[PDB]
Amino acid sequence: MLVQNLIIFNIIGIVLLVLLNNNNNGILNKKSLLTIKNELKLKQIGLIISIINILIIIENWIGFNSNYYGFQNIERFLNIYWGIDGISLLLVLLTLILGPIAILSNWKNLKGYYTYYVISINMLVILMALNFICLDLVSFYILFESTLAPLFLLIGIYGANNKNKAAYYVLIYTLASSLFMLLSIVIYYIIINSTDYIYINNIILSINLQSLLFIGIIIGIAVKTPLMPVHTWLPTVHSESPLGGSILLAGVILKLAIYGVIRLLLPNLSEISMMFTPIIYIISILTLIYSSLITLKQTDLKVIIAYSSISHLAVCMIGIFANNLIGINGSLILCLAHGFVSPALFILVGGILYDRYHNRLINYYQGLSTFMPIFSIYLVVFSFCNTGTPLSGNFVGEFLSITGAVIRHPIIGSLTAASVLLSACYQMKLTNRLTGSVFSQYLHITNDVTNREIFLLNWLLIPTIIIGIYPSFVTNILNLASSTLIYSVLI
Amino acid sequence: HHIHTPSYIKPPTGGWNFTPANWKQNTVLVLVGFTACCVGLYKLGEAGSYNPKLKYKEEELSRWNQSAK
Amino acid sequence: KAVVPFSEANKKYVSSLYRKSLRTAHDWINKTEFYRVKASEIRSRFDANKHINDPNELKVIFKETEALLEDYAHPDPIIPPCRPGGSKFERNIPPRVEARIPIDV
Amino acid sequence: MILLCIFTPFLGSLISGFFGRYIGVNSSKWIVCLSIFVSVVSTYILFIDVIFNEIEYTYNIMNWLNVEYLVVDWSFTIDKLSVSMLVPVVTVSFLVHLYSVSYMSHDPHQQRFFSYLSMFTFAMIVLVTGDNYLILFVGWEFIGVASYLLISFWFTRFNAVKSGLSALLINRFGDALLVLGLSYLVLVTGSVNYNTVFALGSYLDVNMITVILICFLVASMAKSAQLGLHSWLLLAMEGPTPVSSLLHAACLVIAGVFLLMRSSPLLEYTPIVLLLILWLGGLSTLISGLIAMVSNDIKKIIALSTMSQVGIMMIAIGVSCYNLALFHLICHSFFKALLFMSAGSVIHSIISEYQDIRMYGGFRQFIPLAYTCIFIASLSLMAIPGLTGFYSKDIIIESMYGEYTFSGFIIYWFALISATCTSLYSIRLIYYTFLNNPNSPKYIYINLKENDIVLITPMIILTILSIFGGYLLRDIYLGMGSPFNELFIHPNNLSLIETEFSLPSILKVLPLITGLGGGLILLLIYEFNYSLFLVYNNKNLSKLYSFFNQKIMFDQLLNNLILRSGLNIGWLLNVHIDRGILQLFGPLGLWKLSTFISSKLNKLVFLNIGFILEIIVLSWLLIVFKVSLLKYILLLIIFIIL
Amino acid sequence: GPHLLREDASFQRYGQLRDNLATYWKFNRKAARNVFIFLVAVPAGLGYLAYNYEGKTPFVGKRRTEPIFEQDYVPRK
Ligand SMILES: CCCCCCCCCCCCCCCCCC(=O)OC[C@H](COP(=O)(O)OCCN)OC(=O)CCCCCCCCCCCCCCCCC
Ligand SMILES: CCCCCCCCCCCC(=O)OC[C@H](COP(=O)(O)OCC[N+](C)(C)C)OC(=O)CCCCCCCCCCC
Ligand SMILES: CCCCCCCCCCCC(=O)OC[C@H](COP(=O)(O)OCC[N+](C)(C)C)OC(=O)CCCCCCCCCCC
Numbered sequence A: 001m002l003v004q005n006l007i008i009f010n011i012i013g014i015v016l017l018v019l020l021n022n023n024n025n026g027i028l029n030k031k032s033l034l035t036i037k038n039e040l041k042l043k044q045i046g047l048i049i050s051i052i053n054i055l056i057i058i059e060n061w062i063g064f065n066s067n068y069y070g071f072q073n074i075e076r077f078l079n080i081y082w083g084i085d086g087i088s089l090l091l092v093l094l095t096l097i098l099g100p101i102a103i104l105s106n107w108k109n110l111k112g113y114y115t116y117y118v119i120s121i122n123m124l125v126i127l128m129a130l131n132f133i134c135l136d137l138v139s140f141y142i143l144f145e146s147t148l149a150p151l152f153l154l155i156g157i158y159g160a161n162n163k164n165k166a167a168y169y170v171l172i173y174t175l176a177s178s179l180f181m182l183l184s185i186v187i188y189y190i191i192i193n194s195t196d197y198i199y200i201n202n203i204i205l206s207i208n209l210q211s212l213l214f215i216g217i218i219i220g221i222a223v224k225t226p227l228m229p230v231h232t233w234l235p236t237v238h239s240e241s242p243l244g245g246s247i248l249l250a251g252v253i254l255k256l257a258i259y260g261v262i263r264l265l266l267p268n269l270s271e272i273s274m275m276f277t278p279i280i281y282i283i284s285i286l287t288l289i290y291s292s293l294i295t296l297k298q299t300d301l302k303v304i305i306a307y308s309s310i311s312h313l314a315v316c317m318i319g320i321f322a323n324n325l326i327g328i329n330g331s332l333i334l335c336l337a338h339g340f341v342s343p344a345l346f347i348l349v350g351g352i353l354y355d356r357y358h359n360r361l362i363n364y365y366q367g368l369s370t371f372m373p374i375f376s377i378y379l380v381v382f383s384f385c386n387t388g389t390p391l392s393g394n395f396v397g398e399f400l401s402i403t404g405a406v407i408r409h410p411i412i413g414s415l416t417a418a419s420v421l422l423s424a425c426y427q428m429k430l431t432n433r434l435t436g437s438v439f440s441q442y443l444h445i446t447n448d449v450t451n452r453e454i455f456l457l458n459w460l461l462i463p464t465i466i467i468g469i470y471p472s473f474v475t476n477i478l479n480l481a482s483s484t485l486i487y488s489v490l491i
Numbered sequence B: 001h002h003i004h005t006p007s008y009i010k011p012p013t014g015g016w017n018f019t020p021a022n023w024k025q026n027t028v029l030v031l032v033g034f035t036a037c038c039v040g041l042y043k044l045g046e047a048g049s050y051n052p053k054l055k056y057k058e059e060e061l062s063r064w065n066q067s068a069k
Numbered sequence C: 001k002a003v004v005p006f007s008e009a010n011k012k013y014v015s016s017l018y019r020k021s022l023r024t025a026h027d028w029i030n031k032t033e034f035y036r037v038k039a040s041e042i043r044s045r046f047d048a049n050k051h052i053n054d055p056n057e058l059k060v061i062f063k064e065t066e067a068l069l070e071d072y073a074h075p076d077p078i079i080p081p082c083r084p085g086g087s088k089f090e091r092n093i094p095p096r097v098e099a100r101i102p103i104d105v
Numbered sequence D: 001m002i003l004l005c006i007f008t009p010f011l012g013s014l015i016s017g018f019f020g021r022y023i024g025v026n027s028s029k030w031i032v033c034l035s036i037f038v039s040v041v042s043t044y045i046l047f048i049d050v051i052f053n054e055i056e057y058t059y060n061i062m063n064w065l066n067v068e069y070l071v072v073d074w075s076f077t078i079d080k081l082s083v084s085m086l087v088p089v090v091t092v093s094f095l096v097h098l099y100s101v102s103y104m105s106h107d108p109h110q111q112r113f114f115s116y117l118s119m120f121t122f123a124m125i126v127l128v129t130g131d132n133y134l135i136l137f138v139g140w141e142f143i144g145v146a147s148y149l150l151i152s153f154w155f156t157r158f159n160a161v162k163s164g165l166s167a168l169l170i171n172r173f174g175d176a177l178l179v180l181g182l183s184y185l186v187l188v189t190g191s192v193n194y195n196t197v198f199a200l201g202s203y204l205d206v207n208m209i210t211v212i213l214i215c216f217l218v219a220s221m222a223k224s225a226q227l228g229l230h231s232w233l234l235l236a237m238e239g240p241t242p243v244s245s246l247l248h249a250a251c252l253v254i255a256g257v258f259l260l261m262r263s264s265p266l267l268e269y270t271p272i273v274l275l276l277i278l279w280l281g282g283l284s285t286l287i288s289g290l291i292a293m294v295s296n297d298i299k300k301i302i303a304l305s306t307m308s309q310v311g312i313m314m315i316a317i318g319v320s321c322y323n324l325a326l327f328h329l330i331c332h333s334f335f336k337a338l339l340f341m342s343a344g345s346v347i348h349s350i351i352s353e354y355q356d357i358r359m360y361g362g363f364r365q366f367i368p369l370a371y372t373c374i375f376i377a378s379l380s381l382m383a384i385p386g387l388t389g390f391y392s393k394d395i396i397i398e399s400m401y402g403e404y405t406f407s408g409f410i411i412y413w414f415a416l417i418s419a420t421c422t423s424l425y426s427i428r429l430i431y432y433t434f435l436n437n438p439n440s441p442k443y444i445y446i447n448l449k450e451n452d453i454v455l456i457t458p459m460i461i462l463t464i465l466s467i468f469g470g471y472l473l474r475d476i477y478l479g480m481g482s483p484f485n486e487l488f489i490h491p492n493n494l495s496l497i498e499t500e501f502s503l504p505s506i507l508k509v510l511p512l513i514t515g516l517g518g519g520l521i522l523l524l525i526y527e528f529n530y531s532l533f534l535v536y537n538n539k540n541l542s543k544l545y546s547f548f549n550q551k552i553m554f555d556q557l558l559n560n561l562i563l564r565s566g567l568n569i570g571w572l573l574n575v576h577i578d579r580g581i582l583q584l585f586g587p588l589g590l591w592k593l594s595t596f597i598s599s600k601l602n603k604l605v606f607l608n609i610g611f612i613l614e615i616i617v618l619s620w621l622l623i624v625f626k627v628s629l630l631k632y633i634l635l636l637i638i639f640i641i642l
Numbered sequence E: 001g002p003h004l005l006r007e008d009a010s011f012q013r014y015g016q017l018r019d020n021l022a023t024y025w026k027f028n029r030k031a032a033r034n035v036f037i038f039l040v041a042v043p044a045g046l047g048y049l050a051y052n053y054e055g056k057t058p059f060v061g062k063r064r065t066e067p068i069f070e071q072d073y074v075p076r077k
């Protein structure tokens, strides 16, 4: 009853937040108790609900078996079958946790319309969570494009100076591309008469028809996760989007493409994936190398982190397309690890510095460790986590993905090791500059990190380290599920 | 000497020659804690450590190959 | 600019030219008794052109003069530690004094 | 007694890091020194049991990776080789900690310096105690993180903030290759455990073995500051003197050699790598000894001294004499740590706090204790017979001729030049600072005194170990037939017999004869005939001096031609790709095309009966034309858009 | 609120330019040389290693079938 509880609760919650606020429009001036203290009584309801959704998945977690093969909790709601397996459990779990942190990140840095902002965040979180627990290509697409409606309006209403430029980019790049995925989903519905996962996993298609389907789906994936040369939308969006939007966008939305490879490519187009795997490596490795050199010559603060997320999402794609359990498990752990470190960086860069000094030019800031020591501590730690330090969860993902590539292709997959060096250059050059030399002359001394901003960083750091030190909390769940995607015949 | 603004800058390490008024009071309060931790390390260390050259005798290994031969 | 002999502006330029003329020779020769000779030799070379009122020969000698200081320049000049370029430069610079400005973030 | 030896510095590092504000400054330095002291004692207890009573320890904490066949555990074994690395690291680091209490007494940030300094010690202990190659990598990375903080400790100094980044990034280049090597270990063998991997060395292919160890070699070049990646070594002087007294003696610098020694079971069956290791050492020893003779900074000279002395450990590896290199590593951790501390006391003693050796002179009478420590260290560094340097340095050079190969012979002269150069710049450093006419202002000398007892205690302890320690520890490592199977020496590579028997008498004294003769000849020229050493006369000797003084121009070639070029590639992608073609084939390009086409279309919508009449009549031609001509009309229709 | 960042006029022109380089980009014969290298030389450059060696590298436990060390020493004399 997971999905039935999940959708109904939020739909009930949305109506509750709609009723309480919009009842006072009327003809009367807004002298109301609810809007007192920046709608504090309507933000708290929204923050409670995002916490509750985490409790819904936990109720179905304790029943989850880590040893049974296939989809579990199979339920039919809205004439759609919903199931949870090893991979879908951790991505749903990660998605819901980023719910409260997205709301709490913009708790006191909006000019108004907090009720609209809260409902928009929850709808993005639930639709993302529901996307991992569907059981057909059509339903995968519906929850893969429904997020555009709140995401397009969230960026435009609550954006930066260039929000108009970015609002188009997120709407059109993710629609002019995902449509090319609608063609391939439709072809399955014509020649097989169903888009159900289990039905289409067992059907082999001709050598040509797999290529036509692979291209149509890889186009909608190579755009959703920014892969060169169609990566030119995320940096603009990340610069302009609000802190809640940036946290969800690089935290969950870009991981849908990694999960999209698991559902839409590996099982049902298994043969053609082996044919495309050398091509993916050339595209991915050049994405890793270019997106790390491009980051060196950047200036904008939030754009710098935006290109950093691209590099660590190229490592995921390199690992997932490896045909071994080592590559696949590490690619999934890295997505989980990158689901906390990347949102954390946007809190430091675009959620603490920007919320005080209101600028995003790297030339102003330097030597912030002189009067902001606590900010530097989390700046250095989240910088070393983002670079692949062994005690972090990024390293476990980055080691296994690099090792997984070498097993598949020892020659070109060796270039995947460039992420070890390149991630250190552009990242520390930001951390070295932000915490080096005399305190900048352009910045007045202000408040240090507050309790709210400390809380987010501490609860985005701990999961990263826990996975890094002891990733068997994650590997054990995935080991059965990840072993199904592998395609090989040994004689 | 000079003024270094230690009034609001409160890092975990103090900074700029910082020494609290009750530094003697907390000094032993850490020695008591630290000494207990080392005792824990010696109790944990000896209980769990082992010699990897003595777990399996030579006779047992000399037959493992005959099984795998 | 226009080298005007005996002017104050030319006095400073010779003052700068002589200041670098001894420092550069000081770096190559680290024994004082040998360094004293070199300063006298250069001082015995700033007297040959001391009485010259012809601008035409002044530029050519001034062009040569910089070339000599540029040729014999020491790749590793001696710098005082706390002066810029030394070893203690900007070491533990005292923090800038400015009142904190609280903000509601 | 194992778990106490490893994690005690970590506990001390955290206490000052977070509780440091609550426990003052002076009470925070001594607790950190207390935590290290526990580890020093525990190491000797292990050393007694491991080397002498042949007992090994292993504490397996919990599993780390369990992805199919690849299993990696958070385990820390302590075997003979591991303890032989704990003796240099843990003992010196305590002395560096003991030295830093009175060296950093005036620094405003003392609760933070000892937090990273001990964290460095723990990061090294994990490196030399992991029982699988991945745990080694956890320690290996955290030398760089600890060094990056310590080298850029004074973060308000521009030359020191940039120097930390240079030391962090070049090591990551080494760590980039180490990761790649670790992957090929999982590919070929299926695990990264020392036991599993080393047991297969004789059954694995040479090419697969060569590929892994070439990656280890590139990783080691960064850490041991060998040729091609040695720019960071001299740039690391921007940190405090205790940092240089610890990094360059029994720490980050030596960590390259330990990795290659640990891989002896794999390194043996690839002769090609052992050739590359040998040749890197000879060039690095030759080049560093030449650069050190014309440098004019007290810490640069000693820093270049380590690179030459680390290179001596590399050539000892290249002849498959791993026992010699390990023994010389332990010795060098004492007569090179002592040099930095004593040099760090010369700079402290003078009230102008100069570091250029050209502003010193005639200090022998004023600070005779600091001179005596340097002089004993310098003779040991020069391998004078009877001292620790003789029992370790000479035998490595003895065996360069002792292999009797072409490559072995060439490196012998490179060693022999550096063996003499070591005797030449050592005299230069002491003469320029203790036997020369005064250069500093006379006001300094009437205040030029010695330091307190805390700063003196470590130097005396290291002074004794710089005389006797090499003799006492020789037979453990360099003995004939001593059981040291932790380091594998293939039976065809045992050339220790020929080295100690077939060398003529001349070779056994030649480094000393040129060392003693060359030093005295230079000593006379410096004193009575100093007119020769003004190199500004002979343009050939001025260009030569300005060449080695700039360190073979490698700093200029790295900065101006690789980093400057490397950054420009990132600029080209940013301009011609990211903001270039992908913007023409994107929002900016498509706005032009849409504006062009939509401009043509809006002209067509205009109320006119004649206009709409012609198009209706025109469309009747579609019915008339044979439908094979649709593509032409489509081509024509696009033409009219223009 | 209190304008804690002392905005520099020339910094803004710098950031404004660095965010609008694509407007002034012109596809000359030099931008065409860099586009070709980065998009058709290198991708095809790794397009041959990724296929000339794909399925040609059986490295898992590749055993040794060849002696390493010389057996008979011939002096140069
Ligand atoms: C930054 C904010 C602070 C928050 C983060 C702080 C860092 C996190 C520190 C703790 C990390 C979480 C991991 C601890 C949970 C215990 C993991 C575990 O389950 O151990 C498994 C171990 C063997 O597995 P098994 O035989 O299956 O038995 C378990 C069945 N339930 O079963 C056991 O016997 C339990 C063994 C427990 C061992 C104690 C834990 C030691 C952790 C510290 C050492 C970490 C490893 C060394 C790394 C140090 C650097 C080298
Ligand atoms: C998970 C399943 C969810 C399904 C139910 C969705 C309910 C939508 C809300 C209806 C009520 C409403 O339109 O109300 C408007 C609300 C609340 O406005 P406010 O800021 O409180 O108004 C305050 C006005 N003052 C200030 C004058 C007092 O804002 C929204 O529009 C947010 C939610 C919808 C945005 C995007 C809609 C497009 C959806 C496309 C397909 C997914
Ligand atoms: C094996 C892994 C072990 C990890 C644990 C290590 C424990 C040490 C922590 C001490 C922190 C500390 O001291 O940070 C806090 C101190 C406080 O300033 P201060 O230097 O005391 O001077 C105070 C005067 N101000 C205010 C002018 C600075 O520094 C700083 O804000 C400096 C900024 C960089 C901090 C980098 C911290 C990196 C932590 C480790 C990253 C992986």
Ligand SMILES: CCCCCCCCCCCC(=O)OC[C@H](COP(=O)(O)OCC[N+](C)(C)C)OC(=O)CCCCCCCCCCC
Pocket (backbone or CB within 6 Å): A164, A165, A168, A169, A172, A173, A176, A177, A219, A223, A230, D586, D587, D588, D589, D590, D591, D592, D594
């Ligand atoms: C096959 C790979 C598919 C990849 C995704 C598709 C390409 C991305 C295009 C995004 C453009 C965008 O976002 O439109 C934004 C742009 C311009 O931006 P602006 O806001 O006016 O800023 C610029 C402001 N100036 C110009 C005033 C300075 O508007 C347009 O030109 C509107 C027309 C868009 C055409 C979309 C056609 C899609 C075709 C896709 C199949 C080939």
